[PDB]
PDB file of C-alpha atoms and ligand atoms in Angstrom:
ATOM      1  CA  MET T  21     -68.326 -27.036 -59.340  1.00 25.46           C
ATOM      2  CA  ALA T  22     -69.214 -30.988 -58.499  1.00 20.59           C
ATOM      3  CA  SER T  23     -66.204 -31.607 -57.484  1.00 20.61           C
ATOM      4  CA  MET T  24     -65.521 -28.859 -55.405  1.00 19.97           C
ATOM      5  CA  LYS T  25     -64.447 -29.807 -51.285  1.00 20.18           C
ATOM      6  CA  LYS T  26     -65.262 -27.520 -47.853  1.00 22.10           C
ATOM      7  CA  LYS T  27     -63.009 -27.140 -45.344  1.00 19.35           C
ATOM      8  CA  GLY T  28     -63.064 -28.472 -41.881  1.00 22.68           C
ATOM      9  CA  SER T  29     -64.689 -27.141 -38.881  1.00 23.45           C
ATOM     10  CA  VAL T  30     -61.346 -26.518 -35.438  1.00 21.99           C
ATOM     11  CA  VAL T  31     -61.836 -29.717 -33.713  1.00 21.41           C
ATOM     12  CA  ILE T  32     -60.320 -29.432 -29.587  1.00 19.66           C
ATOM     13  CA  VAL T  33     -58.098 -32.355 -29.481  1.00 23.97           C
ATOM     14  CA  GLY T  34     -57.437 -31.517 -25.624  1.00 26.01           C
ATOM     15  CA  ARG T  35     -56.944 -28.929 -23.040  1.00 26.28           C
ATOM     16  CA  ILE T  36     -53.717 -27.047 -20.920  1.00 25.22           C
ATOM     17  CA  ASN T  37     -55.725 -28.330 -17.469  1.00 27.80           C
ATOM     18  CA  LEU T  38     -54.866 -25.205 -15.580  1.00 30.16           C
ATOM     19  CA  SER T  39     -56.762 -26.378 -11.813  1.00 29.47           C
ATOM     20  CA  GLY T  40     -54.215 -28.265 -10.257  1.00 29.21           C
ATOM     21  CA  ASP T  41     -50.569 -27.129  -8.576  1.00 27.54           C
ATOM     22  CA  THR T  42     -49.308 -27.906 -11.839  1.00 26.82           C
ATOM     23  CA  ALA T  43     -50.396 -27.245 -14.827  1.00 25.02           C
ATOM     24  CA  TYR T  44     -49.747 -29.812 -18.228  1.00 23.22           C
ATOM     25  CA  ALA T  45     -51.434 -30.527 -20.753  1.00 21.64           C
ATOM     26  CA  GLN T  46     -54.552 -33.675 -21.696  1.00 23.25           C
ATOM     27  CA  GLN T  47     -55.386 -34.501 -24.820  1.00 20.95           C
ATOM     28  CA  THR T  48     -58.864 -35.478 -25.630  1.00 18.64           C
ATOM     29  CA  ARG T  49     -58.748 -36.964 -29.198  1.00 21.49           C
ATOM     30  CA  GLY T  50     -56.187 -39.176 -31.835  1.00 19.72           C
ATOM     31  CA  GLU T  51     -55.617 -37.820 -35.701  1.00 18.36           C
ATOM     32  CA  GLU T  52     -58.052 -40.074 -36.443  1.00 18.18           C
ATOM     33  CA  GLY T  53     -60.968 -39.049 -34.559  1.00 16.77           C
ATOM     34  CA  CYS T  54     -60.312 -35.476 -34.773  1.00 20.84           C
ATOM     35  CA  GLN T  55     -60.149 -35.682 -38.757  1.00 18.50           C
ATOM     36  CA  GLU T  56     -63.018 -37.452 -38.456  1.00 20.59           C
ATOM     37  CA  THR T  57     -64.331 -35.028 -36.824  1.00 22.58           C
ATOM     38  CA  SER T  58     -63.169 -32.289 -38.558  1.00 22.56           C
ATOM     39  CA  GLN T  59     -65.223 -33.291 -41.488  1.00 20.74           C
ATOM     40  CA  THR T  60     -68.375 -34.360 -40.223  1.00 18.14           C
ATOM     41  CA  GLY T  61     -68.465 -31.320 -37.962  1.00 17.72           C
ATOM     42  CA  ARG T  62     -69.595 -33.294 -34.787  1.00 17.24           C
ATOM     43  CA  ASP T  63     -67.760 -33.631 -32.008  1.00 17.85           C
ATOM     44  CA  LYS T  64     -69.523 -34.998 -28.601  1.00 16.60           C
ATOM     45  CA  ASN T  65     -66.834 -35.317 -26.812  1.00 18.89           C
ATOM     46  CA  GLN T  66     -66.725 -33.311 -23.674  1.00 20.49           C
ATOM     47  CA  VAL T  67     -65.725 -30.248 -23.128  1.00 20.52           C
ATOM     48  CA  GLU T  68     -63.900 -28.772 -20.279  1.00 20.35           C
ATOM     49  CA  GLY T  69     -61.461 -26.647 -18.771  1.00 21.45           C
ATOM     50  CA  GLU T  70     -60.532 -22.242 -19.605  1.00 19.33           C
ATOM     51  CA  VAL T  71     -57.265 -23.758 -22.654  1.00 17.16           C
ATOM     52  CA  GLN T  72     -58.678 -25.120 -25.644  1.00 15.96           C
ATOM     53  CA  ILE T  73     -55.480 -27.289 -27.911  1.00 13.86           C
ATOM     54  CA  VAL T  74     -57.734 -26.961 -31.138  1.00 12.27           C
ATOM     55  CA  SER T  75     -56.932 -29.212 -34.701  1.00 12.56           C
ATOM     56  CA  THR T  76     -56.829 -28.789 -38.110  1.00 14.26           C
ATOM     57  CA  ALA T  77     -56.345 -31.207 -41.010  1.00 13.00           C
ATOM     58  CA  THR T  78     -53.122 -28.792 -41.375  1.00 11.73           C
ATOM     59  CA  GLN T  79     -52.640 -26.794 -37.940  1.00  9.94           C
ATOM     60  CA  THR T  80     -52.375 -27.556 -33.955  1.00  9.20           C
ATOM     61  CA  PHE T  81     -52.638 -23.730 -32.084  1.00 13.19           C
ATOM     62  CA  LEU T  82     -54.374 -23.099 -28.875  1.00 12.81           C
ATOM     63  CA  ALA T  83     -58.067 -21.498 -28.111  1.00 11.86           C
ATOM     64  CA  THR T  84     -58.836 -20.006 -24.469  1.00 12.17           C
ATOM     65  CA  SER T  85     -62.297 -18.936 -23.017  1.00 11.99           C
ATOM     66  CA  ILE T  86     -62.802 -15.050 -22.129  1.00  9.58           C
ATOM     67  CA  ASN T  87     -65.444 -13.827 -21.512  1.00 12.32           C
ATOM     68  CA  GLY T  88     -68.410 -16.786 -22.460  1.00  9.38           C
ATOM     69  CA  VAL T  89     -65.643 -16.648 -26.167  1.00  9.75           C
ATOM     70  CA  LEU T  90     -62.911 -19.121 -27.363  1.00  8.39           C
ATOM     71  CA  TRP T  91     -60.717 -16.883 -29.010  1.00  9.60           C
ATOM     72  CA  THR T  92     -58.363 -17.857 -30.825  1.00 10.54           C
ATOM     73  CA  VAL T  93     -55.885 -16.551 -33.835  1.00  6.06           C
ATOM     74  CA  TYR T  94     -56.795 -16.592 -37.296  1.00  4.02           C
ATOM     75  CA  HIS T  95     -54.239 -17.354 -39.114  1.00  2.00           C
ATOM     76  CA  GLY T  96     -55.169 -20.812 -37.559  1.00  2.00           C
ATOM     77  CA  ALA T  97     -59.215 -21.005 -38.247  1.00  2.00           C
ATOM     78  CA  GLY T  98     -59.182 -19.397 -40.628  1.00  2.00           C
ATOM     79  CA  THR T  99     -63.229 -18.091 -40.918  1.00  2.00           C
ATOM     80  CA  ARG T 100     -63.264 -21.176 -40.301  1.00  2.00           C
ATOM     81  CA  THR T 101     -65.803 -23.802 -38.169  1.00  2.00           C
ATOM     82  CA  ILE T 102     -65.599 -25.436 -34.652  1.00  2.00           C
ATOM     83  CA  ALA T 103     -67.397 -28.884 -34.576  1.00  2.00           C
ATOM     84  CA  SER T 104     -69.559 -28.848 -31.507  1.00  2.00           C
ATOM     85  CA  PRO T 105     -72.367 -31.608 -30.182  1.00  2.00           C
ATOM     86  CA  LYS T 106     -74.681 -30.132 -33.230  1.00  2.00           C
ATOM     87  CA  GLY T 107     -72.931 -30.217 -35.703  1.00  2.00           C
ATOM     88  CA  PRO T 108     -70.966 -26.998 -37.083  1.00  2.00           C
ATOM     89  CA  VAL T 109     -70.855 -23.465 -35.770  1.00  2.00           C
ATOM     90  CA  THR T 110     -70.294 -20.611 -36.771  1.00  2.00           C
ATOM     91  CA  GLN T 111     -67.547 -17.503 -35.443  1.00  2.00           C
ATOM     92  CA  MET T 112     -69.424 -15.150 -34.126  1.00  2.61           C
ATOM     93  CA  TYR T 113     -66.137 -12.927 -34.279  1.00  2.00           C
ATOM     94  CA  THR T 114     -63.818 -12.603 -37.069  1.00  2.19           C
ATOM     95  CA  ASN T 115     -60.510  -9.907 -37.895  1.00  2.00           C
ATOM     96  CA  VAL T 116     -57.869 -10.380 -40.005  1.00  2.00           C
ATOM     97  CA  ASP T 117     -56.750  -6.894 -38.941  1.00  2.00           C
ATOM     98  CA  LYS T 118     -56.279  -8.400 -34.713  1.00  2.00           C
ATOM     99  CA  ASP T 119     -55.870 -11.558 -36.458  1.00  2.00           C
ATOM    100  CA  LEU T 120     -58.822 -12.282 -33.800  1.00  2.00           C
ATOM    101  CA  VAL T 121     -61.376 -15.347 -34.127  1.00  2.00           C
ATOM    102  CA  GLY T 122     -63.988 -16.733 -32.113  1.00  2.00           C
ATOM    103  CA  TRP T 123     -67.139 -18.934 -30.846  1.00  2.00           C
ATOM    104  CA  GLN T 124     -69.751 -19.002 -28.420  1.00  2.00           C
ATOM    105  CA  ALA T 125     -68.338 -21.076 -25.768  1.00  2.00           C
ATOM    106  CA  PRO T 126     -68.550 -24.502 -25.645  1.00  2.00           C
ATOM    107  CA  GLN T 127     -70.988 -25.837 -22.835  1.00  2.00           C
ATOM    108  CA  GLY T 128     -68.770 -26.584 -20.156  1.00  2.00           C
ATOM    109  CA  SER T 129     -65.844 -25.078 -20.912  1.00  2.00           C
ATOM    110  CA  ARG T 130     -65.130 -22.861 -18.422  1.00  2.00           C
ATOM    111  CA  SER T 131     -63.957 -18.581 -18.484  1.00  2.00           C
ATOM    112  CA  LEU T 132     -61.273 -16.370 -17.692  1.00  2.00           C
ATOM    113  CA  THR T 133     -62.330 -12.270 -16.405  1.00  2.00           C
ATOM    114  CA  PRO T 134     -60.197 -10.412 -18.417  1.00  2.00           C
ATOM    115  CA  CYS T 135     -58.167  -8.405 -16.485  1.00  2.00           C
ATOM    116  CA  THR T 136     -58.103  -5.322 -14.849  1.00  2.00           C
ATOM    117  CA  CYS T 137     -55.512  -5.206 -12.167  1.00  2.00           C
ATOM    118  CA  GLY T 138     -53.391  -2.810 -14.409  1.00  2.00           C
ATOM    119  CA  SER T 139     -50.713  -5.210 -13.881  1.00  2.00           C
ATOM    120  CA  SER T 140     -47.488  -5.921 -16.114  1.00  2.00           C
ATOM    121  CA  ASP T 141     -46.087  -9.239 -14.605  1.00  2.00           C
ATOM    122  CA  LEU T 142     -47.480 -12.129 -16.991  1.00  2.00           C
ATOM    123  CA  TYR T 143     -47.530 -15.812 -17.751  1.00  2.00           C
ATOM    124  CA  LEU T 144     -47.500 -17.684 -21.001  1.00  2.00           C
ATOM    125  CA  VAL T 145     -49.426 -20.533 -20.968  1.00  2.00           C
ATOM    126  CA  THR T 146     -48.346 -22.976 -24.089  1.00  2.00           C
ATOM    127  CA  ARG T 147     -49.746 -25.397 -25.951  1.00  2.00           C
ATOM    128  CA  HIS T 148     -46.981 -27.919 -23.271  1.00  2.00           C
ATOM    129  CA  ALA T 149     -48.448 -26.803 -20.454  1.00  2.00           C
ATOM    130  CA  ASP T 150     -45.229 -24.392 -19.404  1.00  2.00           C
ATOM    131  CA  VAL T 151     -45.872 -21.353 -17.495  1.00  2.00           C
ATOM    132  CA  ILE T 152     -43.794 -18.013 -19.107  1.00  2.00           C
ATOM    133  CA  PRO T 153     -42.401 -15.302 -17.514  1.00  2.00           C
ATOM    134  CA  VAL T 154     -43.520 -12.563 -18.892  1.00  2.00           C
ATOM    135  CA  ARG T 155     -42.776  -8.768 -19.056  1.00  2.00           C
ATOM    136  CA  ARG T 156     -45.998  -6.235 -20.275  1.00  2.00           C
ATOM    137  CA  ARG T 157     -43.724  -4.127 -22.365  1.00  2.00           C
ATOM    138  CA  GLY T 158     -46.471  -2.110 -24.216  1.00  2.00           C
ATOM    139  CA  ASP T 159     -50.225  -2.724 -25.380  1.00  2.00           C
ATOM    140  CA  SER T 160     -49.506  -6.073 -27.052  1.00  2.00           C
ATOM    141  CA  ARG T 161     -45.823  -6.814 -26.169  1.00  2.00           C
ATOM    142  CA  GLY T 162     -43.700  -8.430 -24.531  1.00  2.00           C
ATOM    143  CA  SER T 163     -40.216  -9.323 -22.695  1.00  2.00           C
ATOM    144  CA  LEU T 164     -39.493 -13.494 -22.348  1.00  2.00           C
ATOM    145  CA  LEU T 165     -37.549 -13.289 -19.092  1.00  2.00           C
ATOM    146  CA  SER T 166     -36.408 -15.935 -19.870  1.00  2.00           C
ATOM    147  CA  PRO T 167     -35.552 -16.653 -23.148  1.00  2.00           C
ATOM    148  CA  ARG T 168     -36.012 -19.425 -25.458  1.00  2.00           C
ATOM    149  CA  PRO T 169     -36.118 -20.949 -29.309  1.00  2.00           C
ATOM    150  CA  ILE T 170     -39.164 -19.630 -31.148  1.00  2.00           C
ATOM    151  CA  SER T 171     -39.204 -24.267 -31.406  1.00  2.00           C
ATOM    152  CA  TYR T 172     -40.986 -23.908 -27.828  1.00  2.00           C
ATOM    153  CA  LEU T 173     -43.660 -21.104 -28.353  1.00  2.00           C
ATOM    154  CA  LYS T 174     -44.303 -22.878 -31.984  1.00  2.00           C
ATOM    155  CA  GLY T 175     -48.489 -24.326 -31.724  1.00  2.00           C
ATOM    156  CA  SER T 176     -49.490 -21.185 -28.855  1.00  2.00           C
ATOM    157  CA  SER T 177     -51.197 -19.017 -30.638  1.00  2.00           C
ATOM    158  CA  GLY T 178     -54.084 -18.399 -29.307  1.00  2.00           C
ATOM    159  CA  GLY T 179     -53.062 -19.196 -25.570  1.00  2.00           C
ATOM    160  CA  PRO T 180     -53.622 -16.993 -23.147  1.00  2.00           C
ATOM    161  CA  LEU T 181     -51.225 -13.682 -20.916  1.00  2.00           C
ATOM    162  CA  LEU T 182     -52.077 -14.042 -16.961  1.00  2.00           C
ATOM    163  CA  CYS T 183     -52.509 -11.624 -14.715  1.00  2.00           C
ATOM    164  CA  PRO T 184     -50.467 -12.290 -11.538  1.00  2.00           C
ATOM    165  CA  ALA T 185     -54.240 -12.879  -9.712  1.00  2.00           C
ATOM    166  CA  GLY T 186     -54.566 -15.027 -12.608  1.00  2.00           C
ATOM    167  CA  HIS T 187     -56.782 -12.886 -15.284  1.00  2.00           C
ATOM    168  CA  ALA T 188     -56.826 -13.196 -19.099  1.00  2.00           C
ATOM    169  CA  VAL T 189     -54.245  -9.980 -20.379  1.00  2.00           C
ATOM    170  CA  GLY T 190     -54.490 -10.892 -23.715  1.00  2.00           C
ATOM    171  CA  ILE T 191     -54.034 -13.672 -26.586  1.00  2.00           C
ATOM    172  CA  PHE T 192     -50.731 -15.247 -27.947  1.00  2.00           C
ATOM    173  CA  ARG T 193     -50.527 -13.680 -31.429  1.00  2.00           C
ATOM    174  CA  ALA T 194     -46.924 -14.515 -33.116  1.00  2.00           C
ATOM    175  CA  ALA T 195     -43.220 -14.528 -31.703  1.00  2.00           C
ATOM    176  CA  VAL T 196     -39.972 -11.312 -31.432  1.00  2.00           C
ATOM    177  CA  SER T 197     -37.729 -13.552 -33.075  1.00  2.00           C
ATOM    178  CA  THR T 198     -33.503 -12.724 -32.700  1.00  2.00           C
ATOM    179  CA  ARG T 199     -32.285 -15.118 -34.578  1.00  2.00           C
ATOM    180  CA  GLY T 200     -34.677 -17.685 -33.186  1.00  2.00           C
ATOM    181  CA  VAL T 201     -34.389 -16.562 -29.814  1.00  2.00           C
ATOM    182  CA  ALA T 202     -37.655 -15.910 -29.208  1.00  2.00           C
ATOM    183  CA  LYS T 203     -36.829 -12.535 -26.770  1.00  2.00           C
ATOM    184  CA  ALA T 204     -40.059 -10.856 -27.249  1.00  2.00           C
ATOM    185  CA  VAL T 205     -43.491 -11.763 -27.807  1.00  2.00           C
ATOM    186  CA  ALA T 206     -46.982 -10.197 -29.343  1.00  2.00           C
ATOM    187  CA  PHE T 207     -50.981 -11.057 -27.827  1.00  2.00           C
ATOM    188  CA  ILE T 208     -54.261  -8.867 -28.643  1.00  2.00           C
ATOM    189  CA  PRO T 209     -55.334  -6.952 -25.691  1.00  2.00           C
ATOM    190  CA  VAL T 210     -57.886  -8.818 -24.081  1.00  2.00           C
ATOM    191  CA  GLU T 211     -59.602  -5.284 -23.719  1.00  2.00           C
ATOM    192  CA  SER T 212     -58.867  -5.555 -28.287  1.00  2.00           C
ATOM    193  CA  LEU T 213     -61.264  -8.409 -27.195  1.00  2.00           C
ATOM    194  CA  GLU T 214     -63.851  -6.575 -24.393  1.00  2.00           C
ATOM    195  CA  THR T 215     -64.059  -3.963 -27.075  1.00  2.00           C
ATOM    196  CA  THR T 216     -64.512  -6.044 -30.411  1.00  2.00           C
ATOM    197  CA  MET T 217     -68.317  -7.792 -28.203  1.00  2.00           C
TER     198      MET T 217
HETATM  199  C1  OL7 W   1     -37.822 -10.591 -36.313  1.00  2.00           C
HETATM  200  O1  OL7 W   1     -38.929 -10.522 -37.094  1.00  2.00           O
HETATM  201  C2  OL7 W   1     -39.760 -11.493 -36.603  1.00  2.00           C
HETATM  202  O2  OL7 W   1     -39.553 -11.894 -35.874  1.00  2.00           O
HETATM  203  N1  OL7 W   1     -41.062 -10.818 -36.811  1.00  2.00           N
HETATM  204  C3  OL7 W   1     -41.961 -11.740 -35.792  1.00  2.00           C
HETATM  205  C4  OL7 W   1     -42.613 -11.995 -37.132  1.00  2.00           C
HETATM  206  O3  OL7 W   1     -43.527 -12.036 -37.760  1.00  2.00           O
HETATM  207  N2  OL7 W   1     -43.174 -13.646 -36.511  1.00  2.00           N
HETATM  208  C5  OL7 W   1     -43.429 -14.826 -36.744  1.00  2.00           C
HETATM  209  C6  OL7 W   1     -42.813 -15.857 -36.850  1.00  2.00           C
HETATM  210  C7  OL7 W   1     -43.174 -17.778 -36.543  1.00  2.00           C
HETATM  211  C8  OL7 W   1     -41.912 -19.204 -36.163  1.00  2.00           C
HETATM  212  C9  OL7 W   1     -42.515 -19.086 -35.032  1.00  2.00           C
HETATM  213  C10 OL7 W   1     -43.191 -18.070 -33.981  1.00  2.00           C
HETATM  214  C11 OL7 W   1     -43.721 -19.301 -32.444  1.00  2.00           C
HETATM  215  C12 OL7 W   1     -44.419 -19.407 -32.139  1.00  2.00           C
HETATM  216  C13 OL7 W   1     -45.599 -18.208 -32.947  1.00  2.00           C
HETATM  217  C14 OL7 W   1     -46.899 -17.837 -30.921  1.00  2.00           C
HETATM  218  C15 OL7 W   1     -47.145 -18.043 -33.467  1.00  2.00           C
HETATM  219  C16 OL7 W   1     -47.941 -19.464 -33.459  1.00  2.00           C
HETATM  220  O4  OL7 W   1     -47.568 -19.999 -32.294  1.00  2.00           O
HETATM  221  N3  OL7 W   1     -48.867 -20.483 -34.864  1.00  2.00           N
HETATM  222  S1  OL7 W   1     -49.222 -21.618 -34.927  1.00  2.00           S
HETATM  223  O5  OL7 W   1     -48.088 -22.033 -34.027  1.00  2.00           O
HETATM  224  O6  OL7 W   1     -50.020 -21.508 -32.854  1.00  2.00           O
HETATM  225  C17 OL7 W   1     -49.999 -21.871 -36.335  1.00  2.00           C
HETATM  226  C18 OL7 W   1     -49.038 -21.349 -37.992  1.00  2.00           C
HETATM  227  C19 OL7 W   1     -51.262 -21.317 -36.942  1.00  2.00           C
HETATM  228  C20 OL7 W   1     -49.845 -22.998 -36.631  1.00  2.00           C
HETATM  229  N4  OL7 W   1     -47.589 -17.024 -34.589  1.00  2.00           N
HETATM  230  C21 OL7 W   1     -47.458 -17.090 -35.532  1.00  2.00           C
HETATM  231  O7  OL7 W   1     -46.305 -18.360 -36.201  1.00  2.00           O
HETATM  232  C22 OL7 W   1     -47.693 -15.625 -36.571  1.00  2.00           C
HETATM  233  C23 OL7 W   1     -48.037 -16.295 -38.017  1.00  2.00           C
HETATM  234  C24 OL7 W   1     -48.102 -14.873 -38.445  1.00  2.00           C
HETATM  235  O8  OL7 W   1     -47.801 -14.091 -38.296  1.00  2.00           O
HETATM  236  C25 OL7 W   1     -49.026 -13.058 -38.817  1.00  2.00           C
HETATM  237  N5  OL7 W   1     -50.273 -14.000 -39.333  1.00  2.00           N
HETATM  238  C26 OL7 W   1     -51.317 -13.165 -39.864  1.00  2.00           C
HETATM  239  C27 OL7 W   1     -52.085 -14.090 -41.053  1.00  2.00           C
HETATM  240  C28 OL7 W   1     -53.497 -13.630 -41.150  1.00  2.00           C
HETATM  241  O9  OL7 W   1     -53.888 -14.581 -42.032  1.00  2.00           O
HETATM  242  C29 OL7 W   1     -54.065 -15.291 -42.084  1.00  2.00           C
HETATM  243  C30 OL7 W   1     -54.342 -12.136 -40.361  1.00  2.00           C
HETATM  244  C31 OL7 W   1     -53.170 -11.856 -38.706  1.00  2.00           C
HETATM  245  C32 OL7 W   1     -51.884 -12.074 -39.540  1.00  2.00           C
HETATM  246  N6  OL7 W   1     -50.588 -11.284 -38.405  1.00  2.00           N
HETATM  247  C33 OL7 W   1     -49.565 -12.044 -37.142  1.00  2.00           C
HETATM  248  C34 OL7 W   1     -48.541 -11.827 -36.737  1.00  2.00           C
HETATM  249  C35 OL7 W   1     -46.142 -15.558 -38.121  1.00  2.00           C
HETATM  250  N7  OL7 W   1     -45.835 -15.455 -36.891  1.00  2.00           N
HETATM  251  C36 OL7 W   1     -44.673 -15.017 -35.730  1.00  2.00           C
HETATM  252  O10 OL7 W   1     -45.138 -15.297 -34.958  1.00  2.00           O
HETATM  253  C37 OL7 W   1     -43.247  -9.988 -35.713  1.00  2.00           C
HETATM  254  C38 OL7 W   1     -42.285  -9.488 -36.129  1.00  2.00           C
HETATM  255  C39 OL7 W   1     -43.902  -8.050 -35.716  1.00  2.00           C
HETATM  256  C40 OL7 W   1     -45.248  -8.007 -35.671  1.00  2.00           C
HETATM  257  C41 OL7 W   1     -45.955  -9.537 -35.400  1.00  2.00           C
HETATM  258  C42 OL7 W   1     -44.980 -10.861 -35.936  1.00  2.00           C
HETATM  259 ZN1   ZN W   2     -55.724  -9.209 -13.589  1.00  2.00          ZN
END
């Protein structure tokens, strides 16, 4: 009871810059600063962009702002709070059946617009700033035009799938693996997010 620990907050440690003509990852906080920020829940670093790199004490993945909400996967964030300038912020969306959670998008971040193009030529943004062409194959599945080992997708859950116009189409959730090669991906449709809201 007196010994009972508390799980830490999710911490933004970087972002995927998509504003220029070349996408690249940027780190905003190191391991030591991340661990301390996770314990206190107070992150006073300025936030920028749409795709954040987030970390727990044991895991690192991505979070994407869509319509004023920072979305990520439940299997990464759990029910954890996210660190903010004023302290830990409680999740405003939690859906384990969709593998989806969400916080209020932090001040300074920019949001992606939900896609209404109905296009199936998608692009997956990974934590290493790779922009992978993906063809939509269903409501929540897509095939990589160039298959590659799952290692390249590890840590990219919560990242966006974009349409040709840059709209958000879904949130990267899982990789369909065949002998270690990711030929397909599963994602949370943007409409499923829009519903939850
Ligand atoms: C042939 O068999 C199969 O391949 N079958 C696959 C198949 O299972 N693949 C595996 C291959 C892993 C190996 C690495 C994959 C690489 C990248 C992957 C993008 C990422 C990712 O990056 N994570 S991460 O690194 O950021 C991390 C762990 C946060 C820090 N997702 C990812 O790792 C997924 C997490 C697990 O899945 C789910 N956990 C939960 C848990 C919940 O409460 C706790 C509630 C809902 C929920 N919902 C899931 C679908 C395993 N994950 C897979 O992707 C399909 C089968 C059909 C439906 C979906 C899964
Ligand atoms: Zn679109």
